[PDB]
Amino acid sequence: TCPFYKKIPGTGFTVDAFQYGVVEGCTAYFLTHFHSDHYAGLSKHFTFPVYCSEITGNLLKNKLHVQEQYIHPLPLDTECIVNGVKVVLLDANHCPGAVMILFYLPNGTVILHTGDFRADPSMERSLLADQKVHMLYLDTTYCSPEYTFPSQQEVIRFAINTAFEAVTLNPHALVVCGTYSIGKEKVFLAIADVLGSKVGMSQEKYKTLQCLNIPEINSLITTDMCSSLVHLLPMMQINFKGLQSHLKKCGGKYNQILAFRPTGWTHSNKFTRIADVIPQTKGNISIYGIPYSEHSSYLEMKRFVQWLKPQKIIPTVNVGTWKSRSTMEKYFREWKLEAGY
Ligand code: NI
C-alpha cells in the first residue's frame, strides 16, 4: 500500500510510487528521476501513463523496456496541462534528468515536490519566484547540522589535480572510478579530460550513458578498454582485491592504480578539509573516498526552505523512525521562528 507522502491531495497523481501495484484512484504516475529506490516496480509490463523528463523517458524505454505509448516526457520550465491540472518540471540539480514538480491544484493550493535535490541559490530565480507555495514535499536526506560537505566544484578540483599529478609522475598509472547508478558523471569526465583520454566502460554502462543527452558524448566515452587510461567499474569492485584483479587483465600496460570512490557524506567530513584528504594504500594501489554529493547539505536545505517559506513541510526521506521524524520537525520549527513565517 502506497504511503501518504507519495500522494498528491486533490489529484489523481502519485510520485515515485511504482512498487505498490495499482494505486486506487491514480490516473497518472510521476517519476522524478531514474534511481532504483524511486522507479522500483516499473518494467515492460507497466500499462499506466508515466510523466517524467525527456532523459528519464530515454532510460525507461532503453533500459527498463517500458513501451513508448505509456511514456509521457515533458519539457522543463514550461506550464503543461496533465489530466486537467497545471504542472511544471524544474531542474533538481541531482542526477541527469532529475526534476522537481510544481502542481497548481484546482482549489488554488500550490504544491512543490522536490524529488531528490541539491538545493542551490539559482533555484531562487526559477519559476518558483513568482508565487506562493503552500505545501513542500522535501528531500530531507541530510537534514541535520552534522552534514557538511564541500561544493561539487571544490571536489572536482581535488580529483583533477590528484589524477593529473599521479599520471604525470607515472605515465604507466591507471585511473579507475567507481559507479552504481546514474549521477556524478562529472567525476570521471573531468579526470579523463585533463588526461586527454576517453573513458572506458562495459557495454551496459555505455548504453546508459548514451541515453543522457550529454553534449559531444561520442568524443568522451568508449567501450574499448585498451585505448583508454580512465576505466569505470562497478562500485563493489573498488577495493584492494577487485582492483588487483582488474590490473591483471590489462596485460602489463600499467603498474599502478589510482581509484576514486565518490560517496555521499562520511564522518571523516566532521574533522578533515577536502584539501587534507588522503587515500588508503596497499602496494601499488591507492583509493580516495571523495565526498561528491547530489543531495542538499543541511545549510543549503535550510537556506532554500527559509527562502520558500512553505506553510507545511512533508519529508520524503528518513521517515521510518520516531527519533528521525522528531529531529526533522524541531529543525523545521527553528527555521520558521528564525525567519518569521
Ligand atoms: Ni536519487
Swiss-Prot record:
It is found in: Nucleus. The chain holds residues 700 to 1040 of 1040 of the full protein. It comes from Homo sapiens. May be required for DNA interstrand cross-link repair. Also required for checkpoint mediated cell cycle arrest in early prophase in response to mitotic spindle poisons. Possesses beta-lactamase activity, catalyzing the hydrolysis of penicillin G and nitrocefin. Exhibits no activity towards other beta-lactam antibiotic classes including cephalosporins (cefotaxime) and carbapenems (imipenem). Induction: During mitosis. The mRNA encoding this protein contains an internal ribosome entry site (IRES) in its 5'-UTR. This 5'-UTR generally suppresses translation while specifically promoting expression during mitosis, when cap-dependent translation may be impaired. This is DNA cross-link repair 1A protein. Expressed in brain, heart, kidney, liver, pancreas, placenta and skeletal muscle. Belongs to the DNA repair metallo-beta-lactamase (DRMBL) family. It comes from the Eukaryota. Disulfide bonds: none annotated. Binds constitutively to TP53BP1. Binds CDC27, which is itself a component of the anaphase promoting complex (APC). Binds PIAS1.
